Design a protein around this ligand. Structure first.
Ligand SMILES: Nc1ncnc2c1ncn2[C@@H]1O[C@H](COP(=O)(O)OP(=O)(O)OP(=O)(O)O)[C@@H](O)[C@H]1O
Ligand SMILES: [Mg+2]
Lengths: 111, 432, 62, 123, 62
């Protein structure tokens, strides 16, 4: 009862030993060519027939393959809820501000 | 055109201008800077292509400059930038007129303070020592022992000290210690298994005495009247002592070994702070800092670059942490610029160009979280460490002619449609 | 005077030391691919023109 | 080590011979006599005297790092070190009550980039 | 090795102590008293006992 949900965006660097074990596949917009080649090589049903569709996929549209579905197929997701966020910095905004002051000493206390 | 304008101007979140189009110069190009600056970047090209004259444009636009006219004169805004220059080229771009009031820090061989008691072991072994020797082990062991003794003495209040704890420690005292050890002579009488001096006195603790000055050991003679033998570490340290006397005597390194402050006194532990705010600009309140390296020797470049990057990362970390205690993030973002990376960031090299890599590799990965970003520049990516280029997100390119580079690049870039990989060699000068 | 008759639907888990001895073989629809690979690595008279029908087989055919 | 009759044992700076180290060394560090050619008080160096400095340094360094306290000085809620009788409480912060479906998240931004694969393999 | 007092060394079958291995071993083989747990004759094995078997077989073989 142990299973994986591998994710990536640059497969050709992953150990093929693993990709050679997953049953279902999903993919989205994929521009680089090496990846198209690797993928195409993995799958016969995804021959030149459809692999030519990837680079022209919209946002929120995917392509599925494997034993689970009824047949190779295309889909359109809907926005999830609640969305995930990362809470990162915004250089461009903190720079249109003024100029700041610092208590260097306080920082050295921790250092 | 109206369409093109409505697209490239009025459909974006955080407008950052970049230039114009290759087709219609009566048009502008704008992008989202929140993602352009908040991540790692890369620039490439070939000679005579116009790289520096574009980098400079970008930065001048960032800090708010146009036509040698500082717009933010009354107010100095927030922006913090550090540059590793070599050919000493960028000091001209920001060298505005006094009427514009653009303060600027500027360093490089004579107004620099960067002592030797801020390192770890690796750097010290690299500077002071070589490894073409059999007995190197015991020599280095004595070295480390004396170093630790000197630290402990000069800084007794603390504990848990090693060969790596950054705190004051002298060097001339170490040399004196080693000389006394290399001229040592032990007595070999009943109850005299101990260094015998010219005054015929037995020494209790070498560390208590050796560090001050040299002593006068008696002859190592097994004559029963004065049975004595030569110190077990006598006449075995010549090469090292000589190399050290040489290094210290070199006059091109007084910015490092004898870094005097403005007062003219020697530095100490309580000045560890002021050493930093110069690398940032919080000593003169300048948004920029530049590091000239041309007027510097040929052996000790990587060491410096590592020390500096390290001391920046650490500041970012601690400050972001103190700020996050308050339920927030760092409002002191920082940008770094590394040029001619193919020199001190080789794709493949020995130990010489080791340190830098780590001190830089780290930033590539974690900096994005603490407010530290990079900007790489080069013209020979095929000689850089793929490890790094792998991490950048946005890319820029100019005319490329060589083929090994065309190929290595096309192997990476995400959105490289085949219709574009053929343009590069047919690019003008100023087009990107 | 003894024989065998193996059955399975997840052969990739079975031992090859035994499948390496059976002489006649039978098969029906196979959707997963790991199997297909393992299978095609063994059979003695599998022209490429036959290695494609396996997932295209109807109900009741073999 | 001593080099005299009946001195085929390691010698202590206190002029004493060692019987077995498996009971002594783990306690603390010890002082040793000088290596002298004196037939009266002779001594020599062991086979591993001056060969383990770097390996010792790397440990004295890492053990100091605070970014790894979760790995070298992990403490329980009581504020005590772990023993061989809490192996299960560890696993349970990944699984959590077989019933009542559970979710577990891990954040690796804070961990250095030298122990990642190790963490992963262990889990 | 005899685990007795002041005998942290090997003990010959004829009950003699060992001073310099490098002067004895090369000459020929030697026999030691048993590693009997008896407090009177207390003695354990060496740190390398029962490991140099195939590495000693191959040699005499070649
Ligand atoms: N927008 C522009 N239009 C036309 N020419 C330009 C433009 N910008 C720069 N140049 C020309 O490019 C030259 C500067 O080249 P630059 O110094 O950037 O090359 P480089 O990238 O440093 O090459 P290398 O590193 O090999 O020296 C200048 O002489 C200038 O005339
Ligand atoms: Mg240039």
């Amino acid at each position: 009862g142990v299973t994986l949900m591998v994710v990536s965006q640059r497969p050709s660097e992953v150990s093929e030993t693993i990709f050679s074990q997953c049953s279902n596949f999903i993919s989205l917009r994929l521009t680089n060519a090496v990846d198209q080649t690797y993928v195409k090589s993995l799958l016969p049903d995804l021959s030149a027939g459809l692999g030519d569709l990837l680079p022209n996929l919209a946002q929120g549209e995917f392509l599925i393959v494997g034993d689970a579905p009824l047949m190779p197929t295309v889909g359109h997701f809907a926005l999830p809820v609640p969305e995930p966020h990362s809470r990162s910095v915004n250089y461009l905004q903190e720079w249109n501000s003024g100029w700041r002051h610092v208590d260097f000493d306080s920082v050295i206390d921790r250092w | 055109p109206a369409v093109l304008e409505g697209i490239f101007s009025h459909q974006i979140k955080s407008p950052f201008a970049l230039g114009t189009l290759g087709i219609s110069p009566d048009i502008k190009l704008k992008i989202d800077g929140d993602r352009f600056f908040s991540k790692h970047v890369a620039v490439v090209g070939s000679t005579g292509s116009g790289k520096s004259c574009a980098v400079a444009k970008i930065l001048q636009t960032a800090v708010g400059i146009e036509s040698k006219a500082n717009a933010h004169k009354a107010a100095q805004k927030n922006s913090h930038i550090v540059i590793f220059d070599i050919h000493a080229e960028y000091a001209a771009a920001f060298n505005l007129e006094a009427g514009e009031a653009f303060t600027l820090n500027l360093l490089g061989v004579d107004n620099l303070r960067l002592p030797y008691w801020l390192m770890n072991a690796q750097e010290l072994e690299q500077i002071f020592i070589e490894s073409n020797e059999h007995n190197s082990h015991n020599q280095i062991s004595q070295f480390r022992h004396a170093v630790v003794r000197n630290k402990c003495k000069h800084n007794p209040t603390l504990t848990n000290l090693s060969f790596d704890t950054p705190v004051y420690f002298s060097i001339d005292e170490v040399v004196t210690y080693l000389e006394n050890m290399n001229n040592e002579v032990i007595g070999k009488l009943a109850g005299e298994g101990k260094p015998k001096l010219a005054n015929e006195t037995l020494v209790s603790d070498r560390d208590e005495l050796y560090f001050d000055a040299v002593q006068s050991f008696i002859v190592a003679s097994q004559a029963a009247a004065t049975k004595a033998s030569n110190g077990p570490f006598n006449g075995e340290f010549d090469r090292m002592i000589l190399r050290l006397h040489t290094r210290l005597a070199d006059p091109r390194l007084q910015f490092l070994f004898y870094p005097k402050k403005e007062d003219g006194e020697d530095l100490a532990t309580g000045d560890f702070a002021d050493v930093v705010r110069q690398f940032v600009g919080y000593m003169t309140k300048s948004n920029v800092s530049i590091i000239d390296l041309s007027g510097i020797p040929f052996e000790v470049l990587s060491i410096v670059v590592s020390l500096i990057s390290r001391m920046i990362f650490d500041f970012g970390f601690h400050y972001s942490k103190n700020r996050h205690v308050g339920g927030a993030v760092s409002d002191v973002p920082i940008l770094v610029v590394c040029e001619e990376a193919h020199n001190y960031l080789p794709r493949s090299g020995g130990a010489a160009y080791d340190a830098s890599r780590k001190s830089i590799e780290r930033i590539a990965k974690e900096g994005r979280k603490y407010g530290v970003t990079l900007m790489v520049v080069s013209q020979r990516p095929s000689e850089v460490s793929e490890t790094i280029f792998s991490q950048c997100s946005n890319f820029i390119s100019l005319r490329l002619t060589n083929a090994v580079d065309q190929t290595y690049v096309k192997s990476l870039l995400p959105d490289l449609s085949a219709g574009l990989g053929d343009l590069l060699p047919n690019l003008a000068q100023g087009e990107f």
